[PDB]
Amino acid sequence: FLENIQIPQRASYIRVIMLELSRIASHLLWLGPFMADLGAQTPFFYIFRERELIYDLFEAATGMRMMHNYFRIGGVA
Amino acid sequence: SKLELLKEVYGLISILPILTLLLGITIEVLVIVWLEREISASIQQRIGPE
């Protein structure tokens, strides 16, 4: 974004999908543990069962489990 | 004669039923911990202590 290697708007929308899924990746990994801190004793494993699908997504997208190396320089991986 | 005590040496008490209660309560402790570790962590989870 600094040296202006023009990122297409389609790849930009792909990155938007990424970012708005990471919003979920944060919402779960807070609320679940937040439920396990506030007093909600049972739903701990519940939110992990919900999150299981994001694991398959991050795996099949670019990387092993955290989707590592989904951002190259001239676009994405 | 009856110098100190004829029938009162040690033969008036039996410790069988007390030990049966001990065995029963220990077995029931096993049952209840099995109940816990197999129902609490298995409502929406995997099986307990397999």
Q: Which residues of B touch A46 (CB under 8 A)?
A: 44
Contact A49, A55 (CB under 8 A): no
**Token digits for B31?**
């049952």
Contact residues on chain B for A52, CB-CB shorter than 8 A: none
CB A40 within 8 A of CB A48: no
Compute CA A24 distance to the chain's CA centroid, rounded to the nearest angstrom.
Answer: 7
Resolution given for this structure, in angstroms: 3.7
Residue in chain A lying closest to B40 (CA): A42
CB contact under 8 A, A49 and B44: yes
Residues of A with CB under 8 A from a CB of B: 42, 45-46, 49
| DSSP letter string, A2-24 | -S-----HHHHHHHHHHHHHHHH
Q: Among A56, A64, A71, which residue's Cα sits nearest to residue A18?
A: A71
Please give the Cα distance from B45 to B50 (Å, whole number): 13
A67 φψ region: left (φ > 0), alpha (ψ -120 to 50), beta (else): left
